[PDB]
Each structure stands twice: as structure tokens, then as C-alpha cells.
Write an enzyme that holds these catalytic residues in place. Sequence first.
Site: not given
Ligand SMILES: NC(=O)C1=CN([C@@H]2O[C@H](COP(=O)(O)OP(=O)(O)OC[C@H]3O[C@@H](n4cnc5c(N)ncnc54)[C@H](O)[C@@H]3O)[C@@H](O)[C@H]2O)C=CC1
Ligand SMILES: NC(=O)C1=CN([C@@H]2O[C@H](COP(=O)(O)OP(=O)(O)OC[C@H]3O[C@@H](n4cnc5c(N)ncnc54)[C@H](O)[C@@H]3O)[C@@H](O)[C@H]2O)C=CC1
Ligand SMILES: N[C@@H](CCC(=O)O)C(=O)O
Lengths: 501, 501, 501
Positions: C126, C195
Site C-alpha cells: 500500500k 505497462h
Molecule cells: N477504489 C478501489 O479500487 C478500492 C477501494 N477500496 C477501499 O474502499 C474505500 C472507498 O474508496 P474509493 O471509493 O475508491 O475512494 P473515493 O475517493 O472514490 O471515494 C471516497 C468517498 O467517500 C467520501 N468520504 C470521505 N470521508 C468520509 C466520511 N467520514 N464520511 C462519509 N464520506 C466520506 C469522500 O469524500 C469520497 O466521496 C476506501 O477505504 C478504499 O481503501 C477497497 C477496494 C477497492
Molecule cells: N504498450 C502500451 O502502452 C499499451 C500496450 N497495450 C498492450 O496491448 C495488449 C492488449 O490490449 P488491446 O489489444 O489494446 O485491447 P483492445 O484491443 O480492446 O484495444 C483497446 C483500444 O486500443 C486501440 N488500439 C489497438 N491497437 C492500436 C495501435 N497500434 N495504436 C493505437 N491504438 C490502438 C483499439 O482501437 C482499441 O479500441 C495489453 O496486454 C497491453 O500490454 C495496450 C495498451 C497500451
Molecule cells: N486498493 C484496492 C485494490 C487495488 C488493486 O486493484 O490492486 C484495495 O484496497 O483492495
Amino acid sequence: ADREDDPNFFKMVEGFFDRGASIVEDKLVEDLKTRETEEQKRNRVRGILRIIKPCNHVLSLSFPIRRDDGSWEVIEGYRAQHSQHRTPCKGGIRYSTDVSVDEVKALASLMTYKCAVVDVPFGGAKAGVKINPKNYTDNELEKITRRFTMELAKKGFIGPGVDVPAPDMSTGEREMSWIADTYASTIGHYDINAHACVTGKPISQGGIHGRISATGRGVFHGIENFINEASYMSILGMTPGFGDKTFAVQGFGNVGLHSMRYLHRFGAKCVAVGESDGSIWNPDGIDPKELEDFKLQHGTILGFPKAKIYEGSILEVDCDILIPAASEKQLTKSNAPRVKAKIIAEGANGPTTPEADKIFLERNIMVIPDLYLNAGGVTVSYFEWLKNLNHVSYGRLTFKYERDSNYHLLMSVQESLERKFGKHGGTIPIVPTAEFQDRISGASEKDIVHSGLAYTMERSARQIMRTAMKYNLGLDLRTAAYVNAIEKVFRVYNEAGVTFT
Amino acid sequence: ADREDDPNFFKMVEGFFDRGASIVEDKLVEDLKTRETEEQKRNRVRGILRIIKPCNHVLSLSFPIRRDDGSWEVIEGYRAQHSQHRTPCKGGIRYSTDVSVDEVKALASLMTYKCAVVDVPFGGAKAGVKINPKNYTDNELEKITRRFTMELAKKGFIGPGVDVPAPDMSTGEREMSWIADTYASTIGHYDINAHACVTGKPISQGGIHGRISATGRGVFHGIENFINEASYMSILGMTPGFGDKTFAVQGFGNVGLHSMRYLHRFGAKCVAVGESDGSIWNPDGIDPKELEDFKLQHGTILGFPKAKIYEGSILEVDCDILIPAASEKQLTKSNAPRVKAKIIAEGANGPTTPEADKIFLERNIMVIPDLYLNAGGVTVSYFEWLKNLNHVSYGRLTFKYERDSNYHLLMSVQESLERKFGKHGGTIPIVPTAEFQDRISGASEKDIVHSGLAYTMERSARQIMRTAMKYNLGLDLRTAAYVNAIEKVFRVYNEAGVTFT
Amino acid sequence: ADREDDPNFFKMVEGFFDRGASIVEDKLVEDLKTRETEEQKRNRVRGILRIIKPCNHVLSLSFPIRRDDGSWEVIEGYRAQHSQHRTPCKGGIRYSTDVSVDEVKALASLMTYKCAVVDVPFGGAKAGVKINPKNYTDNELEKITRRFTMELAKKGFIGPGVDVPAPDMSTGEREMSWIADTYASTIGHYDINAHACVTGKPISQGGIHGRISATGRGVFHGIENFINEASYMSILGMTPGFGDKTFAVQGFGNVGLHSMRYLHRFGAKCVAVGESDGSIWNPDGIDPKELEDFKLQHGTILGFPKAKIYEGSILEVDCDILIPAASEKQLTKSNAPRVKAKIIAEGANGPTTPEADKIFLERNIMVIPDLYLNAGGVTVSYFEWLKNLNHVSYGRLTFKYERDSNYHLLMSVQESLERKFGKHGGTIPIVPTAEFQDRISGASEKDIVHSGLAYTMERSARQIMRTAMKYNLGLDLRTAAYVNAIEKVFRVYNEAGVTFT
Ligand SMILES: NC(=O)C1=CN([C@@H]2O[C@H](COP(=O)(O)OP(=O)(O)OC[C@H]3O[C@@H](n4cnc5c(N)ncnc54)[C@H](O)[C@@H]3O)[C@@H](O)[C@H]2O)C=CC1
Ligand SMILES: NC(=O)C1=CN([C@@H]2O[C@H](COP(=O)(O)OP(=O)(O)OC[C@H]3O[C@@H](n4cnc5c(N)ncnc54)[C@H](O)[C@@H]3O)[C@@H](O)[C@H]2O)C=CC1
Ligand SMILES: N[C@@H](CCC(=O)O)C(=O)O
Ligand SMILES: NC(=O)C1=CN([C@@H]2O[C@H](COP(=O)(O)OP(=O)(O)OC[C@H]3O[C@@H](n4cnc5c(N)ncnc54)[C@H](O)[C@@H]3O)[C@@H](O)[C@H]2O)C=CC1
Ligand SMILES: NC(=O)C1=CN([C@@H]2O[C@H](COP(=O)(O)OP(=O)(O)OC[C@H]3O[C@@H](n4cnc5c(N)ncnc54)[C@H](O)[C@@H]3O)[C@@H](O)[C@H]2O)C=CC1
Ligand SMILES: NC(=O)C1=CN([C@@H]2O[C@H](COP(=O)(O)OP(=O)(O)OC[C@H]3O[C@@H](n4cnc5c(N)ncnc54)[C@H](O)[C@@H]3O)[C@@H](O)[C@H]2O)C=CC1
Ligand SMILES: NC(=O)C1=CN([C@@H]2O[C@H](COP(=O)(O)OP(=O)(O)OC[C@H]3O[C@@H](n4cnc5c(N)ncnc54)[C@H](O)[C@@H]3O)[C@@H](O)[C@H]2O)C=CC1
Ligand SMILES: Nc1nc2c(ncn2[C@@H]2O[C@H](COP(=O)(O)OP(=O)(O)OP(=O)(O)O)[C@@H](O)[C@H]2O)c(=O)[nH]1
Ligand SMILES: Nc1nc2c(ncn2[C@@H]2O[C@H](COP(=O)(O)OP(=O)(O)OP(=O)(O)O)[C@@H](O)[C@H]2O)c(=O)[nH]1
Ligand SMILES: Nc1nc2c(ncn2[C@@H]2O[C@H](COP(=O)(O)OP(=O)(O)OP(=O)(O)O)[C@@H](O)[C@H]2O)c(=O)[nH]1
Ligand SMILES: N[C@@H](CCC(=O)O)C(=O)O
Ligand SMILES: N[C@@H](CCC(=O)O)C(=O)O
């Protein structure tokens, strides 16, 4: 060369080590001031000594080259890294059909102890390629050398910080230039010290003044330190100095020729010169300049106009000093009783078996050992390596400053004297002698190599003599050298905790 | 084990190679579509074959460990990398006092040809540590394994992209776990594929289902493929199938035990089991689960309640199938005439000398060769390596999708039939069989290992049989295997330009 | 948020761990197959569990940025890597003034156990940057993110093979795009997997379908699995299913909004939505798209036309399901007795203190724990990482093949039926259902994410329920989850030899 007395080369060197270990073992235990004074003190001392003896890493290679005629051929190669108590490892590359894993391991261990004797901070290493270079074109030898360099580099057996090769039998400036060029052009392209990956380079390529002749120059200095010590010349029944002495040289290569040049320069008389095809002899003396010029012209020493094709062993020629400067195990149980010289100066690596050493001892023959006597090569390689790391030629930053400083110093004496013996003492010119005039700017690369080498050979000879007297070893200089080597290497292993375990 | 017929192990394998090379040399020359059809075509073919035979890199190690009692010991080790026409190199680690440079080089070359036989894209390698593991504590064996790993890693002799070890004699899951842990915790700390540095790992650390028993499972599949060809069973005077046959097993380790489990499972009868201390015998059959339970309890085979302590060679017991699954060169000129079995299934590496193969040929004994028969180990190691590179367990992304897809597929048949045979036909339920229900979600890791192994052993057996018929080799399956191996490896060297020279 | 009950966050998580450790110790000791059946068994189980709890590496940073107005400011940052029993480490980046070493260490350990619960092969990590993003321009946030990435990269705290960050509080797609771009443009310029250094990327830069909503989608699946188990709904005195239930949501961010979307979609009705400035309430239901569109327009929840500004704690609102989806330690000793909901679904990380868990147990309130319920985020991050390593979009190689294969399969049924019910039965068209027609080409990226997530959440719910019954834990699902996590992580440490020591 002798089917009676032909010991395994690695084990022969281990025997020399065992013998020196025997003598110091008490001193090591008593130095050790640990609370275990129990005779696990003795036990840890001989556990460490068993760790020091074997080689840590050996690499064996097979790689293909395509010959000039279009044929494919498989080349065999080896590099042993004996010890890493100092880094990098240091040791030469031998091109010869007698190359083998045991030969390379044996020479690698000799490098470790040799470097410890002259206080050169390298661990020991050695390489060999099993070919006869006379059967290959220059183009083929370049291909073999460059490819060998990359196979070593890929596995961590060459590099400025692990392992720095150098010339040996049938390699020189030319091969070293090839090695340095392919290292620096590939794996070393970003390394600030890439050209320190190998020594014995040509000058144009980072080489140092006098490297080719360095090991011959050190052979002279080693002999001189002992030939001028009346206590050792008494036991021999001989007169100190060079001006009246004869010597014979087995091997007319880089070591043999330059040993001859320097001994001849200080009044010794070369009587016999032996080679792979035969020997030549003249009791009136052979001139090294004439012999070299003949050898360069005809590719052989036989037929030299001013000497006569000598039959029978060069090692038994009658002379004061025998210099074996060819391969190893030339003096054996067989020919040792017929040697006729009173000083044997080993320019080559391991030319004397342990049985031959016993005979020479009984016979009051002084063997100046390889560990000490041929270490001028690695000493000047060390200077070359430092020159590469420093990226300036010696003195270039300071010549003018130092010259100006010395003249103002002498002028300080002048003006102080005139100030006191004023008017009618006159002008009182203080000027350099001819000899000081020639040092007025400070040392150059050539001066450092000459005086640094002389300093090292002398300091090392005194340490060997001190140790031989302390333990009543007489003319067993080999055991005294190993004693010094072992003490130095033991201290490093002891205070390091041995290893990562 | 026999001073009449004890060939150098490396050269013995080169002999097998030379044989297969004889037979194909014509087919290689004629294939070769090059403009200069001189039978200097024949010259390049025989230059390439000389390049393939020797090992490219061999590393020899000495390193110290401090034992549990406090004494220092020097451990000797070796790893040979035979070929790099495919990368990485692949091969096991043997802990044994019989380990030597020649033994390791010999097994490394066997790995190259074995991998070519089963179309596994690895070059061959092998390692050995010269110790007897039943003289060391577990803590000492961990120390030795972890340090050996670091010494190999420092010089480029282990890594997911150069050289991937595996278990062999006296190593298993436990040692592999140690190897993977110190690799990944040190020089692999930033490598996304660090745990693919070794195979045969425990499941919890990236291992794959069935790796321990994989080479036994492949021994079963290899025998089955030949024991079910009537053409080969005719020449032997024998009935196809397992239900009626007896076998004996030399060596009750990882290969021997599991070969016995799978053969027992399909109706063969184990009559004799031989070990390092003695053999046991029972013409009514030995049960593998009771024998292993006894072995686990008592650390030995002797004294097993339901068999008798048999004196005289296990290799001479009377049976249909002899499975040598211990060390190498067990069948020699000496005891080959007394073998009594009709099929010799080499589970071990190189258990039969070339003289013994001579005798077996004359006497219509079928030797199923190691190159083919024990390659189930490296095949499932290959699966483990791919599992590590892919970073998912097989099927985890697709189980739910695939099951839903299959039910909608069957429902497409249902609804199509109902639409056609409307009301009067009623409801027409289309449901999986019991066996399809079991595959409704697609393959899992277990399924891929089992069917991938069976697929490989069958495809390889058919290629060996095809080649033996096409050159009239009869029951010389070994020469047919080498012919296939050579053909494949030659094609790679030929179209690559050989080397960067 | 509460002085009474405000435990140190790291130790609070260690408390949860201790509690599960207490329940499984016996099982671990008895599994343990070792000769020391002493309580030297229980001693090594206790020693391993002590190794698992603390973080292995924590990096603390201070770096300067110059703000848009030209002043210099010092930014504080942290990243903790809790465990490396699986690699890489995985965990989000939080931008918040409440960030601290202890908060980051606590969340890093939660990531380890969470990943073990859903069988995702990552160790926990984290990161936190101690700023309020509302006080910075977009240009400043980009400079902070890019510089933070380089400081982490220099010390080995980000990379596809060590540590893969992701979004958390106040970071999303945008920041992840910045992280991936400066990693790939500098230190990762030669890395084929550059990436994959971070997840939660935009689709255009390697992101995966549905990552933003993934953790909300998993919250729905986690509730579903338990809200449809009659045995748990009996103990609660409520009716299985969603169609009749009410819920409230604390936090309208990425987790809160999408949890609301999916629950609303399957017939639940959102009564209350709380945020950082206030809450809103409506017993008739709140629509998620209206409320998101209002929030996007006005930057706040307050003043939403179709609900009434509610005063008093969102956590005490009257409803069936309370979803805390904001920060941690919101349910405490204090307000736990006034909760009114029967199911608490922790979308956020650590929203419930151990004292509040005590109270909820006594009142038969079911807490679905964070370890399990919010793990849909890391599960779909795992899918994104694999997509990056594989370098193809799912199905692109096989769509056409698979579609052709399915039609030929159905045609095999059709022709087989016609070739038996000849021209007496006519033409028998076999065609896909509407549902199968949609799957005729095989899975796409979207299908794998949806079904792979559903598969994971339901297989994990099973394992938690199994383990709760087996130890008579009732509604203490948290302790059951930790029990599963501990068993899995213990197995890895045990069979690895713990560490290179
Ligand atoms: N975003 C992710 O991929 C994941 C996040 N989490 C956890 O879930 C929780 C939610 O995070 P996200 O929605 O991603 O963040 P976010 O920043 O999108 O949402 C947080 C929201 O809660 C509000 N907030 C903050 N303090 C508050 C309080 N005391 N009372 C009411 N609202 C409050 C904020 O203003 C914001 O609107 C966090 O604890 C995070 O660690 C868990 C798993 C995945
Ligand atoms: N090297 C980089 O920065 C990136 C690499 N990739 C690699 O490509 C792999 C597969 O993902 P995708 O096939 O992209 O998913 P995908 O086929 O859904 O592509 C997402 C979007 O990327 C666009 N796209 C495809 N080839 C392109 C090119 N040569 N230039 C610009 N845009 C293009 C497509 O129109 C599509 O809408 C991933 O595993 C990833 O690591 C994907 C995105 C960015
Ligand atoms: N930050 C998210 C997960 C992030 C991730 O997708 O690796 C959590 O608290 O679990
Ligand atoms: N190259 C160096 O700087 C150093 C070399 N040495 C050792 O000195 C020895 C020789 O010096 P190199 O520089 O190798 O000289 P070199 O390789 O230039 O010449 C060796 C000479 O010995 C001759 N030779 C070979 N076998 C012979 C035999 N049985 N009898 C007579 N002559 C024979 C060869 O024909 C050749 O003339 C080697 O053992 C080497 O290891 C020792 C210290 C430094
Ligand atoms: N990078 C490389 O490949 C090389 C580096 N060096 C480094 O240079 C340092 C000093 O050695 P030097 O002062 O050269 O010995 P030096 O000054 O005695 O030079 C000897 C020869 O090098 C020639 N030289 C000087 N600069 C040159 C240039 N730019 N191009 C071609 N030739 C040139 C001189 O004219 C003279 O002929 C050493 O410490 C070494 O590290 C030396 C040789 C090759
Ligand atoms: N383990 C693997 O994955 C594969 C192993 N092999 C080969 O199989 C053979 C052995 O299999 P391992 O797995 O090493 O088994 P192992 O090392 O687990 O057990 C070897 C067994 O053979 C017994 N043994 C040793 N010397 C013996 C002798 N002279 N007579 C009778 N019994 C003896 C030992 O006591 C032990 O029971 C070796 O040749 C190995 O190279 C071949 C392919 C794959
Ligand atoms: N980085 C490492 O050291 C390891 C990496 N892997 C990678 O994982 C990929 C898939 O293998 P698996 O899915 O594990 O095979 P799998 O699905 O058969 O799992 C094997 C065992 O690992 C356990 N496991 C899963 N996630 C875990 C976690 N976060 N902590 C502790 N134990 C956990 C499972 O419960 C199962 O008992 C492989 O391709 C391999 O690259 C696998 C094992 C160790
Ligand atoms: N083979 C050979 N080398 C020579 C000869 N003369 C000089 N050298 C070497 O060439 C290098 C440069 O020689 P010089 O310029 O004369 O300087 P130097 O160091 O005083 O030469 P020396 O004292 O003989 O070593 C030194 O390594 C010499 O040993 C010679 O006649 N034959
Ligand atoms: N040493 C030993 N291994 C066994 C035994 N039984 C099964 N195994 C191996 O342990 C692993 C787990 O066994 P299973 O879950 O039954 O898997 P499996 O593929 O059906 O087992 P097999 O078909 O017998 O290989 C497999 O690799 C088995 O080969 C046994 O009795 N002794
Ligand atoms: N913030 C927000 N995200 C949405 C909304 N609608 C869809 N999404 C997300 O944007 C992505 C595009 O959705 P779709 O293309 O319709 O595919 P989908 O997988 O059927 O979408 P969902 O079932 O809603 O998850 C999905 O990840 C949705 O979850 C919305 O109204 N607001
Ligand atoms: N090869 C020489 C010298 C090695 C070196 O200069 O490094 C020797 O045997 O000592
Ligand atoms: N060591 C086994 C297998 C090695 C491996 O699985 O890579 C053999 O001799 O074939």
C-alpha cells in the site's frame, strides 16, 4: 618429459603449500587470540587452510570456429579463478596443446600465492586454450581469441572487476589487443574501466612501458638481491656480484630473452640457450641482440653463426646460474643429480618437481622460486591496471609545476646564502646535478615502472630471507615464500568470517 | 559395478550419438539444398555433428560450509550446459558421491537429445554436488543447497532464461523449494519470472500437480505404447496388454515407486524390488502402497513382511519387464546374457552399456531407451515452467464462462428439436453424460498434465516406430530415438548459421 | 472520529489476525508432518505466525515540488510492502492528509490477507501521499504523481515484478495513467512488461473493461452469496433475495457509487447516501444515475432535488444493509449499539473496530468483512495485469475459428439426425439459441471479467462459510476469513524454509 617423476601439477603445488603450512601452523594458532584456546584453535586454522587450497570457480568451454579453408573445428578452453580474497582475479592466457583443467588450476593457485608474496592485491586465475598457434593463420587466431573473450564474458570470467587476463606461453600484445577490443566494444561499452579488462596491451591501447620485458627485468632483480647477499653466496662457495658469472637459459621467449638481456647488461655471460628444437652453446658468451636478430630472421636459434649446436640437455650445461624459462616440470628426480649449476632461478612457472627440490637441497643448490622470481610480470600488470583506472599518464598534470617548484627551491638556498655571505662572497649559483636535472620534473611512467618494480622485488626478497632465517630453512627459499603467502592469505580469510554461511 | 565393461559415461553417450549419426548422414546430405552439392555437403554435415556433441559450458565449484558441529568443509559441485540451440537449458541436480565432471557432462547431453525426442524446447543441462546426503543434517543440506544456488547464479548457471534445474537422485521438492527461495530473494528480486528459475517445486511455491510422479507416469505410458503394438510383441513372442505380465524394479525412489504404482494399477504384477541394500521377491505380487508404507516407517525395503529377502541380482530376476530405475551402467557385458526379461524399460538415465545393447539385440530383447521413456519428468517440468510464466492456474479465468457456454450449446440442440417435433414429441431433455458433466467447465491443471503427457508420449512413440521401420532397425529403438533427436537438432544449427563467427 | 474507541490501525488488524490464529493453531500443528512432534511443533507454528504479521519493507519519502504559484513545497509519501511470499506485491495509492506510516502498514497487511482469501497470487502492499488533492491544480497533481513514481522506482518499490500499484481514495484512472507513463518512459524503457507496472489504467493505455466499477460489482456478488443463504438469513430474521430490501451507503466514490448501481439494478432500494459534507435521505428510494448526474454537475450530494438533507449519522439510518464505503474506523464502541441494520457490508478497508465487532456479534448483526467483500478490485486488477503480460486482447486470435467450429459442431448433429430420419423426417435445422448465438465466438475481455469475478466471489464465499461452520463461528465471518488467509500463507512459509537464513 619424464615418466619416472611426473606428479599431477595441481597436487604438486598443493604439496608446496602443505609444507609451508606445516611450518607456520604454530604461529597461526598462537596469533589467534580467541577465547577458545582449546585446540579447536588448531582445528579452525587447518579448516581455513583447506578452504584456501582448492579453486573456487573453473569454467570449461567448447566453441566452434570455421577455419580459413571452410572446415568447422571445435576449440577447447578453460579459465580457473582460484581465490577471491582479493578482487579482481589476475592471471595469464596460455595457448598450448598441453593445456588441461589440472594445468590451469595449478597455475591459478600459483598466481594467488605469487601475488601475496609481492603484495599485489589480486586473487589468482589462469586460462588456457588447447591449440598449437603455429598451425593457425593470424586470421584464425584472431577469431579464436575474440570468441573466447565473449564466452568468458558471458559467464563472468573476464572483466575489470572480476578477472583480468594477461599474456603467457604463445600469447602476447597482439592477443591482448584483441581481447580488450571485443570486451570494450560489446559488454564493456558503458563501463568507464572497460580497457582495464586485460593487461599486457600494446601502448597505443592502454599498455604500460616495459610490460613485455617486465618479467625478465624482475628475474634480474630477484637474482641480484640474492647474488649480492654474502651469507647465501658463502653456503654456495661463490663470489658476490655478476661480473664473473655464467648462465644458461632454457626457453628464448618473452621471459627467457629479456632475462638474458638484463643479465648480459650487468656483466654476466650467457653460455647456452635452449629451445623447443635444440640448444646452442659457446663458453665465450652469446650476445642477446645478435641471437634475437637471428631468431627474428630465421624463426629458430639453430644455426646461429657464433655458437655451436649443442647436444644433450640444456639443463645440464655447465654454468653458475640455470634459468628454466619454458614450461613446467623440467627438473625431476632423473636429471636433478646432473645439473652442475649452483643457482636455479625459476623464470617459468613450476619448472621443478618436489623430488628435484629435495636433491637440490642435499646438494647445496639454491632454487630461487617461481612464486617470487617471476612476479615482475604481475607487478607491472598491476601498474598497467592502475594506469587504466586513473585515465592519465603519470606526471602529465604535474611536470611543469614540479619543474618550477624545484628551481624555486634551489633558488631559496641560493638567495639565503647570498643574503648572509653578501657582497664579497659574490654570486653563489645552486644548480641541479646532471642526475637531478633528469628528475627535475618528477617521475614519468617509465620511472615508476622501473623503480616501483625494483622496490617490490627488494622488499619481497628481504621478507623471504627474514622468514628463512627465523625458521632455519637454509636454502629452502620456496618454503619461506609459501610461509609468507600463507600468512597473508590466512589473515584475510580469518578476519572476514570466511564466507557467506 | 563391473570392471570388465565400464566405459566412460560421456563417451558412451557419444557412441550412441555416433550410431544414429551414421544412419541419417545420407538423409541430412540430400535434404541440404545448397548450390554446391560436392560431397563437401557431407563435410558441413559432419562438421555440424561434431559441434553438437561436446558441452558448451561447464562450471566447477568449490565452496566452504561450516557444519553443525562447527568444522569447516569444502563442498564440490558442477553444472554442465550442453547445448543452447534452445533456451533455457534444462536438467536436474544430483546429490551423490559418484558425481563427477564426466557424469554431469554425460547427463547434460542426454537432456538435450531427450528434450528433442519429446519436442520440449529446452537445451540440455545437469548439475551434481559430490556429497552423500544421508551424512548431513537437514540444516546442513539447506546450507549447501542455498549456497550452491548463489554460486551458480553469480556465474549465469541458473535463471529463468538460461538454465532451469530440477530434482534428480537424492533431491526433491524440498531442495527445489530452497533453490527457488534464495534465487527469488536475491538476484531475482526484480524479475517477474523469478520462480520459474527451477521446477519440481512444491505446489505451495509454484509447483504443478503430479510433478513428483510424472516420470513414473510417463514410464507407464511409454511401455503401454509398445506393449500394445502387436508387431513388436510378435518379435518378442508375447501377448499384447498388461493384464498378464510381471515386472521387477531396480530402485524404489521417485521413478521406481511411481512406475510400480501405475503398472500395478493396470493389472501388471510386481515380483521383485531391488534397493541399495538388498532386494525382495514374491512371485504372487508386491503391493506398492504397503511397500511404500513399510519403507516410510523403517527406512528400508528389507524385512518387508509379505515378501522374501532375495539374494542375487535384481537385474536377473525372472519377469517380463525389467525396470532399472537407479543409477547408470547397471546392465553390462557381464550380466546381459542372464537377464531373463523380454522388455527392458530404462527409467534411469544410461543404465545399459553399448555392449549390453549388442547382446540384447542378438537375443531379441527390447530395450525401450531412456531418451524416450523417462522424458515424462522433463515434459511436466516444462508444464510447470509455463504455469509460472503465465501467472494463472489453468482454467481459473474460464471455468464459469465455459460451463455456461456448454449448457447453452446443449440447449440449442434441445430447442431446435422441440421446435421441429413440436407438442407431440414433448420435452426433449439434452443433458451431459456423466463423463461430459465432469468436463463441463473445461480443463484444469490436473487435466492438462495428464492429457498433455499422454499426448506427448504417444506422439513420440509413433515417431520412433516410424523411424525404426524406415531404416530397418528392428528392436534397436535407441538408435531410432537418436536419429529423431539428431535430425531436429541438426536442422536448428544448420538454419542458424551455426555460430556468430 | 471517536475518542472513546480509536485503536491503532495496524494493531487492530493484527488483533483480527491473532484471533484467527488462535482458532487454527491446533489444525496447523496437527497437519505439520515432522519428527519433532514435541510442542516444538507448536513453537515453530507460533514463530512463523510472528514472521507473517509485520511488514518486511517500508519506504518513507520527502521530495520537493514547485507549485503553480512558484513556491517550493515538501511532499511526504510512503509505501509499505507487507509480504513477499507471492510476488509481485499489490496495493493501491491513497492521496489523503490522514496518510501515515501506520495507516499504510495496516492497509498493506490487509492486502496480503485479502489476496489470499480470493486466491490472487500477490503479496500485499500500500502507498500513501499526505496531501489533500482538492487543494492542488491538475498540473500540480501530475507533477506530484510523476515524481512519486520515480522516487519509488529508484528504490525498488514499483515494477511489474516487485510491486504493482492501483487506485484508492482520491486517485483513479488519471493518476494511474501518469504512473504508467513515467515508469515506461524511463526505467522501464527496455522492459517488455513495462505497462504492467500499475493497474487501474485507462483502457487506451492497457486498462481492462470494468476495473473502475469492479469493486462495486464484487460488493454486489459478495452480498448476493450471503443474502441468498437461508441458513444465515434465518439467524437474521429476514427473507432471502434482494427484491424487498433497503440499504444505505456511506461514501459516494468509486466503491460507493457502483455498489449502489448494481444493488439498485437487482431490486434493492437505496434510502440514504452519506458523504464528507452531509447526507441525504428518502425512504422511497434514490436513483443512482440521477444522483451521479447531480454530483457531477454540482460537486456535491447536498441539495439533491429528490431527497431531503438528512441530519444525524448515515451509519444509524434505518435500513437492512449498511455499506460503509468511505474511510476506516467508522463503526466504534460508541455508535455500534444504534446501527439498526441487520447486515453490514464493508466496502471500505477496516471500517469496523474490534469493539464494534463484539457488539454486532451480540446483537446478531452480520458483518461481511472487507478481506472478502471488497476484493473484487484486486481480482480485476489481477486480470488487467495478466492482460498486460499476454499482449493480446482476449479472444482476438480465436473469435473466427471458434465461431466456425461451433457451426460445424451443430451441423454434425443436424447431418447425423437427417442421416437417420432420412427424407421421412425432412430437414432438421439445428441453430443456436439467442443466448448461445451471443457466445458463438467464445469469451471476450468483458465476458472474462464478469464471469471470472463471479466465479471468484462465490468460490471464496463457499470457503468462508465452510470454515465458519467447521469452527462454530456463527456470524463471525471475519474470523473465518482470516482463518482461510492464515492457512494459505502459513503453508507457503512452512514449505519454503521460511527465509535464507
Ligand atoms: N477504489 C478501489 O479500487 C478500492 C477501494 N477500496 C477501499 O474502499 C474505500 C472507498 O474508496 P474509493 O471509493 O475508491 O475512494 P473515493 O475517493 O472514490 O471515494 C471516497 C468517498 O467517500 C467520501 N468520504 C470521505 N470521508 C468520509 C466520511 N467520514 N464520511 C462519509 N464520506 C466520506 C469522500 O469524500 C469520497 O466521496 C476506501 O477505504 C478504499 O481503501 C477497497 C477496494 C477497492
Ligand atoms: N504498450 C502500451 O502502452 C499499451 C500496450 N497495450 C498492450 O496491448 C495488449 C492488449 O490490449 P488491446 O489489444 O489494446 O485491447 P483492445 O484491443 O480492446 O484495444 C483497446 C483500444 O486500443 C486501440 N488500439 C489497438 N491497437 C492500436 C495501435 N497500434 N495504436 C493505437 N491504438 C490502438 C483499439 O482501437 C482499441 O479500441 C495489453 O496486454 C497491453 O500490454 C495496450 C495498451 C497500451
Ligand atoms: N486498493 C484496492 C485494490 C487495488 C488493486 O486493484 O490492486 C484495495 O484496497 O483492495
Ligand atoms: N608471460 C609472462 O609475462 C610470464 C610468464 N611466465 C612463465 O614463463 C614461462 C615462459 O615464458 P613465456 O612468456 O611463456 O615465453 P614464450 O611463450 O614467449 O616462449 C616460450 C619459449 O619456450 C620454448 N619452449 C617450449 N617448450 C620447451 C622445452 N621443452 N625446452 C626448451 N624450450 C621450450 C618455446 O619454443 C618458446 O621459445 C611460462 O611458464 C610462463 O607461464 C612467468 C611470469 C610472467
Ligand atoms: N579509452 C581507451 O581505449 C584508452 C584509454 N587510455 C587511457 O589513457 C590514459 C593515459 O594513457 P596515455 O596518456 O595515452 O599514455 P601516453 O600519453 O604515453 O600515450 C602514448 C600514445 O598515446 C597517444 N595518444 C594520446 N592521446 C590520443 C588520442 N586522443 N588519440 C590517439 N592517440 C592518442 C600518444 O600520442 C602516444 O602516441 C590511461 O590511464 C588509460 O586509462 C589509454 C589507451 C586507450
Ligand atoms: N527424478 C526425475 O525427475 C527423473 C529421474 N530420472 C533418473 O531416474 C534415476 C533415479 O530416479 P531418482 O528420482 O533419482 O530416484 P531417487 O534418487 O528418489 O531414488 C533412487 C533409488 O535408487 C536406489 N539405488 C541407488 N543406487 C542403487 C543400486 N546400485 N542398486 C539398487 N538401488 C539403488 C536408492 O536407494 C533409491 O531408492 C536416475 O538415473 C535419474 O537420473 C530420469 C528422469 C526423470
Ligand atoms: N510468486 C510466487 O512465489 C508464486 C507464484 N505463483 C504463480 O501463481 C500462478 C498460479 O498458481 P496458483 O494459482 O497458486 O495455483 P493453484 O490455484 O493450484 O493454487 C495453489 C495453492 O496456492 C494457494 N494460494 C493462492 N493464492 C494465494 C496467496 N495470495 N497466498 C498464499 N497462498 C495462495 C491456493 O489456495 C492453493 O492452495 C502460477 O502461474 C505462478 O506463476 C504460484 C506460486 C508461488
Ligand atoms: N626485444 C627487445 N626489446 C627491447 C630492446 N630494446 C629495448 N626493448 C624494450 O623496449 C621497451 C622500451 O625500451 P627503451 O626505450 O630503450 O627504454 P628502457 O626501459 O630503458 O629499455 P630497457 O632498460 O632495456 O628495458 C623496453 O621494454 C625495453 O626492454 C631490444 O633490443 N629487443
Ligand atoms: N508417493 C505417493 N504419491 C501418491 C500416492 N497417491 C497419489 N499420489 C500422488 O499425489 C498426487 C495427488 O494425488 P491425486 O489427488 O489422487 O491425483 P491423481 O492424478 O488422480 O493421482 P494419480 O493418478 O495416482 O497420479 C498425484 O500426483 C499422485 O500421483 C501415493 O500413494 N504415494
Ligand atoms: N460511473 C458510471 N459508470 C458506468 C455507468 N454505466 C456503465 N458504467 C460502467 O462503464 C463501463 C461500460 O459499461 P457497458 O459498456 O454498458 O458494459 P457492462 O459490463 O454491461 O456495464 P455494467 O453491467 O454496468 O457493469 C462498465 O464498466 C460499467 O460498469 C454509469 O452510468 N456511471
Ligand atoms: N601470466 C604471468 C603474469 C600474469 C599477469 O601479468 O597478470 C604469470 O604467470 O605470473
Ligand atoms: N532430471 C530429470 C528431469 C529434469 C527436468 O525435469 O528438467 C531427467 O534426468 O530427465
